[PDB]
Amino acid sequence: DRNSVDYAQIASGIDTRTTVMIKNIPNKFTQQMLRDYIDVTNKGTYDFLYLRIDFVNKCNVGYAFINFIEPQSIITFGKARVGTQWNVFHSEKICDISYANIQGKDRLIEKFRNSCVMDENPAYRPKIFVSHGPNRGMEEPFPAPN
């Protein structure tokens, strides 16, 4: 449907959405593990990342928000990973993606900057990264509440 990812439509320039949900994430995956996993194929290509952690059992919610700087980077990630197993914790789960209903680094910042997660352990908060220029991909401090 509307949120299904179609690499052919990205390549031809008729869908320029950039924000994607990474799905079927094994329970015990950490945000650090996900950052490293994405960076195997997609280092420097994204500027927002958030894998929500349930603090009461250190299990994640099973899906992550990622905003790619250029939509074509969705093809890089999806052609490498979608349909393959996470191969951790003896999980049977398989990586998959769909488009998010919220789109864009700016919207994602506004969505989380005033939210409760910014007041819990700063290690597991949403992250943003420099979108352009020589330092593209470097983590940026998350904007303060407004």
Q: For residue 85, what is the DSSP state?
A: B
Cβ-contact 10, 70 below 8 angstroms = no
Backbone angles phi, psi at 32, to 5 degrees: -60, -45
CATH number at residue 120: 3.30.70.330
Backbone angles phi, psi at 75, to 5 degrees: -70, -45
Q: How many CA atoms, within 13 angstroms, populate the side-chain half-sphere of residue 66?
A: 29
Single out the residue of 34, 3, 24, 17 nearest to residue 127, CA to CA.
Answer: 34
Q: Flag whether 79 is in a domain.
A: yes
Query: CA 89: distance to chain centroid?
Result: 21
Q: Flag whether 114 is in a domain.
A: yes
Q: Flag whether 145 is in a domain.
A: no
Q: Flag whether 42 is in a domain.
A: yes
**Total number of domains constituting the chain:** 1
Q: Flag whether 2 is in a domain.
A: no
Q: What share of the chain is helix, strand, coil (3-state, %, to 5)?
A: 30, 25, 45
Structure-determination approach: X-ray
